Symmetry: D2
Subunit: 494 residues, 4 copies
Amino acid sequence: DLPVLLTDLKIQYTKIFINNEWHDSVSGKKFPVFNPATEEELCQVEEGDKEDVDKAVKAARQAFQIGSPWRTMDASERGRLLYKLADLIERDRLLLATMESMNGGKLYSNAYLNDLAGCIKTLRYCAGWADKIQGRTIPIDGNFFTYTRHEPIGVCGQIIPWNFPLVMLIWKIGPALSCGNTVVVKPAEQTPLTALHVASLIKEAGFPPGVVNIVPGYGPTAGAAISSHMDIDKVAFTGSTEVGKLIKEAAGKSNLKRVTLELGGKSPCIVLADADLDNAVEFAHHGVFYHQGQCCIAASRIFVEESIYDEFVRRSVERAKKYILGNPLTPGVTQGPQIDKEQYDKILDLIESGKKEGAKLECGGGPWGNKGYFVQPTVFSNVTDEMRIAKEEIFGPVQQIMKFKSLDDVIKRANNTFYGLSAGVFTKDIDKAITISSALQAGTVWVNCYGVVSAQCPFGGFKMSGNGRELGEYGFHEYTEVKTVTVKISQKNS
Amino acid sequence: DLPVLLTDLKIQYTKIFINNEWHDSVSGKKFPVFNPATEEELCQVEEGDKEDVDKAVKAARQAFQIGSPWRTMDASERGRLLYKLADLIERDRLLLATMESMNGGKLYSNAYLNDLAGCIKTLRYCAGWADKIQGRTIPIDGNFFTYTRHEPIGVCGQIIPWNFPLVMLIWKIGPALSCGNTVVVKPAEQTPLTALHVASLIKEAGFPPGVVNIVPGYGPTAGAAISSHMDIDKVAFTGSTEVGKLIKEAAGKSNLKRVTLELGGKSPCIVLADADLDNAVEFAHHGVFYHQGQCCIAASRIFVEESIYDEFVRRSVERAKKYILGNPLTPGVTQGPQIDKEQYDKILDLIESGKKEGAKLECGGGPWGNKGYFVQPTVFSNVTDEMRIAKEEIFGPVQQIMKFKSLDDVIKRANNTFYGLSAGVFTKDIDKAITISSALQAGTVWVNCYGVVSAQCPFGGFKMSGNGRELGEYGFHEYTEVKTVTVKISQKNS
Amino acid sequence: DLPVLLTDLKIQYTKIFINNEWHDSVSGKKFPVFNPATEEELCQVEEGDKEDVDKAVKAARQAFQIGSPWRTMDASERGRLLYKLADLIERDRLLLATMESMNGGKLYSNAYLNDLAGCIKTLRYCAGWADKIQGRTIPIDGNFFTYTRHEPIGVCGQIIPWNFPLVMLIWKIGPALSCGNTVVVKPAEQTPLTALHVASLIKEAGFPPGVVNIVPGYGPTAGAAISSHMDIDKVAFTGSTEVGKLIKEAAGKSNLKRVTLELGGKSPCIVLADADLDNAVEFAHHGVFYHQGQCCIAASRIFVEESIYDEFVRRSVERAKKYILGNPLTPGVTQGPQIDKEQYDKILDLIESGKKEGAKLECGGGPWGNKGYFVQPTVFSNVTDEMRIAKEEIFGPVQQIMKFKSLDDVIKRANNTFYGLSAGVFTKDIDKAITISSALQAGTVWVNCYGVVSAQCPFGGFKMSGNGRELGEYGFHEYTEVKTVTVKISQKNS
Amino acid sequence: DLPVLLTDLKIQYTKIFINNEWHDSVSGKKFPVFNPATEEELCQVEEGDKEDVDKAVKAARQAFQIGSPWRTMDASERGRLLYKLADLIERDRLLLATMESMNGGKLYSNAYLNDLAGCIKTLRYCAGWADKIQGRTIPIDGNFFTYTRHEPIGVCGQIIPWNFPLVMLIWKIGPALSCGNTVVVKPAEQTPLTALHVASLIKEAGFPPGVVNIVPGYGPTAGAAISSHMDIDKVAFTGSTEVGKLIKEAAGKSNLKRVTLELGGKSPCIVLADADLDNAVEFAHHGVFYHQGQCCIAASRIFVEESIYDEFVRRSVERAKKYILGNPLTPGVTQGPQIDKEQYDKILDLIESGKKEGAKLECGGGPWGNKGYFVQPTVFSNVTDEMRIAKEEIFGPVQQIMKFKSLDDVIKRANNTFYGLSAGVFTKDIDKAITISSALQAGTVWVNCYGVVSAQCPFGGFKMSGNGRELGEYGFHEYTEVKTVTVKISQKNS
Ligand SMILES: NC(=O)[C@H]1CC=CN([C@@H]2O[C@H](COP(=O)(O)OP(=O)(O)OC[C@H]3O[C@@H](n4cnc5c(N)ncnc54)[C@H](O)[C@@H]3O)[C@@H](O)[C@H]2O)C1
Ligand SMILES: *C[C@@H]1CN(C(=O)CCCCC)c2cc(O)c3ccccc3c21
Ligand SMILES: [Yb+3]
Ligand SMILES: [Yb+3]
Ligand SMILES: [Yb+3]
Ligand SMILES: [Yb+3]
Ligand SMILES: [Yb+3]
Ligand SMILES: [Yb+3]
């Protein structure tokens, strides 16, 4: 069941959030924010730039100082604060879900039941870790007492994208804060609004000032100032491969800050003849079309064994043909728009490449409507490995389906990409499930399912799909700095 | 006790080591290798360059392929292989120690009793981990079985320096191999020889071909080809901040490979009035002069509380004045040369800056001898925080001593550097030992000792002194890639 | 600040709690419950016996069955349920604290500010673990996939004592439930009431029926039926050494169930001449007198170095002489009664042994008041190691102080006991703090403090003070059963 | 390939081993040791009793004292010592294997290729852990530094059985010693000889005296003195349920020492219609007949789905009919004797119960030969759940095969036993493999294999099959005692 906001959303928070107060931009400049389903302005927002990032970094540094309230509070109280934020987000769930849908072009049903839930669940997960982050005592050679501290790193700059604005903000802040760090978050220029509202809830929960700062703004302005900043200790980023490379170079040129990246993919599924066919069709379908194709882990190469390939394709087309396009707020609407003009153009251009390069068009294949950055859900069959639609992350509702006969051949083809975020394997054979999943060069491999992401599991890429892991026990590693303390003693005993 | 080689060292291995065979350089070119204590050529060595690195990467990739002997062997057998290599290195300890001393300008006493021991101990430590690297089973939300694999990453390029050629080679290969990776090692152009001999012992132990490849050569040639290579998954590096930055940028520009760095420091000691004074003098002394100052963790800023500062300085000068310079092979010689002309020039130039900038010269202060890159052991007192000798890693036998009265002031001064590899605290106060060590922004902090490094402890920098950690349990994290496998099931139970 | 219940406590829950419903005893029998400060009946409570325990075990077994709601729910939802229970306990904190004080003879100030807080903090701690309990994937020899499950054990019987009725109930259920077990709790015959109220809050939070069952009753009746029961998988117990031994034998005779025990102690402090004297006096004082001496970790042997021994004793007597005895509900009252007649008799009898055996009486030494099981706070100096008051856990407000000159001698004396729950070390010497704490045969050692117990730390005894550990990461180990699953595969890869 | 001892085994070590020296029994008494294949005396051995155990405990206590060589040596050197012992055992492998075969009635092929290998592999595994056992640093509430030490426990008494005398000795000592404990081992009265030889190799490796003591002798004499001893901190035991219960009661009555038990089982296999039939037959066959049925994890209930049940039975009988009985030293001999008269009688008596109770005799069913405790390999089909051969651990070469139609029914039947050491599941269905293995109440579950035991995996029972786990990472937990140290500090920082 699914409830709605009984009143019309009114936008309130549109300023830069530093030391728990609302600032105008140093420049006085502001920037517009649109609804992608209508192409209308929703409001203006203060535009942050290097000067404003330099302010937020100073605030974050200050909040991190030895002796400060964020450093001296019990770790269990950092956990409490996060737990409270989660309760507050749950309180304003209608709201947040509506603003997410409206600003992000995200179906309200998903915004409410999935994104909002994932934020809340992820925060509570991270809250639980806070007083469970532990170092070691170590039986070193010689007469010494050695222990390690898993300290927070320091000031972490976090640049996040427009496809899951709330989920991504919580993926970034939840771990960073649980570990004791301070943060300067730069949301996507497209979608600053849910993050500014969450800033209001950070202040209301009671986080010390300067622990979380949020600086709306553009990428090459505000984002670049984060990646090149001499007093930011770590940057985390989700988005394009292009920018991931810039961020990394910038970090090398500046202060050798720590860098973690998540950068999308061209994730493959391998469907064996023995697979439960309908389950495979369903998961691969939802796997590529979710949020209009705008998932890093979109199942954008589906390799099906020859003998079921035609049945797979036909069932996939039947399912793709059942969508209702329109405004993500209206019940029964099952596909929203793409986020903006740039993505719209890229998607249409890649669809054209597919027609031109000889792929078989099964359905969709062009735009839709008079306003909104809508794209008809599109299926291509008989796709081959050198076509643009097989190589490049599309990030639109465009499904590629391809055949294989040889199992060693298809694993090489699945692995033959600089991407490596995720993969899917559909089979009833125990041995093949284990061996295939071992052999795939991907950070997450699903067996007989797809797109299952949980707070308890580390998530990240092999190869150019990123470095590091987020969430799970393992993800917390990227938000600590280990210090070894070795103390001379007269005589050690085991 | 200390034994020696009964015969004169004869050099045998001077070629590139790829797929367990000895190759000449693609170019035919060779490069000379010197003894730093005499400035004489010891031999020529094949000079590897991009072409040769492209060969070694192909070999490493091949050895890493699914189904290969290195991927399918039991993890306990990877451990055995490392254990055997350690026994072989122990067998050829006289030898190795002699070649290390002769090529590296390292006192034979240290080469034998410390470096060689650290290599052997470190290898056995790493051998033990091999079948103890484990993933997780994870109680994810929903009806799924989720587990993680901590796989090896893949082909790791490892560029190492000239100050601890053997120890560094083992620090790099020991973990990488224990975790299951393959490697392409580029030793320092100055000191390839002990590494080629170890390659002979890798072949003799039985490592599959292509698991370890060693490509002697220069930095901007062979080293750069590693850092920019499109099929190397990870690079590890110890050396200069300058190159660390290049390596990182290169990795960003190329294939976003994983990068870990160790980059030296300007490590501080803080000596409180209550410290056991003689213990502090001794450890800080050995801490800065070890291996002619050529330690990443050299104790190159010693802050002493005013009331014991003069006694500290006088005792430090008395100890510095007791060295015998000369050839590192001769018993009773207690200081060898610096590695090469570049380091010699840098050290003399920094000493001059100290005289010029007003520091107080207590002893030494210029070169020594008719041949060899020798520098008299030098002590400067009344040094201040803006002088070059207080800011820049010297990497020579040059000790800085400075005073403090204010404890909060001295921690800010100790932290006021882009470095952060290590620090030392000397006090009898329990509270101060814990609070000071917590407040110092350094990767290792010693209390009432200095320079204690063990295989069981993670080791690495805060800030520009590096990223990542080596050794200990924690260090193994940087040589694995985590994959999450999530399997759909009918019904889960706790 | 300290608030109170605005209305007079009315007792409501007095029945056996099985499958979330309230049962009368099979026998029809009931038993009285007293206030120890007045010796008046507070109510009658259903008296559970073997028959009633057999009912609760059947219910717990049923709730544990594969496919049941408690086994299939997400681990994160077990965490939620515990978190909710913690919020409910916080809601009824006035209440609970009042009933704890009234039934338990516990100062209301402590009941409210310490016990109630510890319950809430401990529950939230345990809630956080629930979805963070993880098994392993293991690189076994041969072509196998091996993983482990850290399953709940099953039905856990938990017998708890009268000194910290609420804290102990939460220490027991929090971990057991977080790990996924079901429980049959037998509270102390003296103090069933706060636990029955918590049962009401378990039902209200939404725990599936049969997950927590609470059977008030006597030790040799209901407690013995738990320890000898053929379908209880684990028993946990806090209380007397005598019963700990019976429980263990019973477990051996019956079904070899798992057993963990916490059994008090005769915990020593060692105060060195260099110790901060006032801090030592204060912590050792509060350490032995807390809750009328009725702490398992009471600091009931204080060894002070000769040269400060007289000053220590005098300051200790000054502090002991400042208590106000009376009803634990009245503000400014700083010592309540002992729990019951048995403890009262034991304490007076041991005090008499101290007078008789030649100890020096500094203050107190007999009973107090016309009603209530009150004992004057008593200090004995010049106590020696063979006197009853040095050997036997008193569990009353009776402080022993003794001298030492020899440090090796005093560690042997501190260790010379079959107990080993905890110890205290007071010194400013870093080396002595580490070496002494290493050498003491005790489960928790405090340095320069005493009595610091936190949810994040494992807690339990060496030697006859118990087996196993509670709380911390480590404590969760005792509430899981590890299963190894080993799956044959065609070919493994690292 | 399989080598043999070129000379006739001569027995040398036959005395009690305390403080690395050979002692006669206090009583002067000696006891005989037999070969089970001939019923001839091999030698006499000193008979240890309470007095001798009291000697070994004093020696172990002494070697454990703070300041002793075993407590102060580096953990890495404990690892070295174990590694050396493993090399020595490998050196004397011919030997040891021959004595194991001759004394134990174990096929020499298995003794050499399996037992001896498992000992060596297990020791090297445990050697690797020694300096990797680590405590924690813990972010406790309040201004404290808290860390934990995972100390050795102390003196561990280890009573081991006659079926795997060498493997069991190494399973016990390897972990105990790696963790830093001292031990008093009581081998089986039947099979002391390989353990005394290993004692000689312990002395030769260089273990400090008193670290390992070995006291041959009887169960109710020497074994009971261990279990009831007031200065033994822990007992570990593998053998009968009967004695496991006595040991536990004894531990409760005496000093509440820690107890771990492994106690055999009645382990079930479940073979589904879709299973690879020949693989299932093979593994279940070897699974019950290994070492003449004398495995704790013998697959002694095989449930086969009706539709393949007859084919399963026929193939199982064909395989059972191919054994050659005789002397375990002669090549091509594939079944040795049972260990002694007691086991021989029990096995024949249980076989008779099977005939009498209506089971179907497929082959074997009585004794063999003129000397030796030989039993013909016996197969029973149509066995039902209430027959003695379905309920009681036989520990002889007697295979039970039974049918099922209902999958929920067969899991209840498999679980319907107080045992729970291990189980086997044979299926090609992924879902069933996971769900069945989850639902089985057994410590190890194999899928599509059986009897796979490795040093890297924890091993132990659910229910009356034991408590605790041996080996793996997890097994080390049972050989440490955790101490929490909590230090007061002026101000903590994260
Ligand atoms: N222990 C420590 O941290 C220290 C140890 C040594 C010096 N440390 C510091 O650096 C200074 C310069 O020494 P150099 O000797 O010039 O080091 P380089 O960093 O260049 O180090 C040489 C190693 O890097 C390879 N290299 C060079 N250029 C390269 C390139 N463009 N791409 C890839 N690789 C390149 C090179 O071939 C060799 O293998 C010293 O004075 C120390 O302060 C700290
Ligand atoms: C170079 C650094 C210093 N060092 C010492 O052993 C110091 C001895 C003097 C004590 C005050 C040392 C040892 C090992 O093993 C290293 C390994 C790797 C890098 C640096 C060192 C050092
Ligand atoms: Yb289906
Ligand atoms: Yb000294
Ligand atoms: Yb010169
Ligand atoms: Yb004080
Ligand atoms: Yb087969
Ligand atoms: Yb006979």
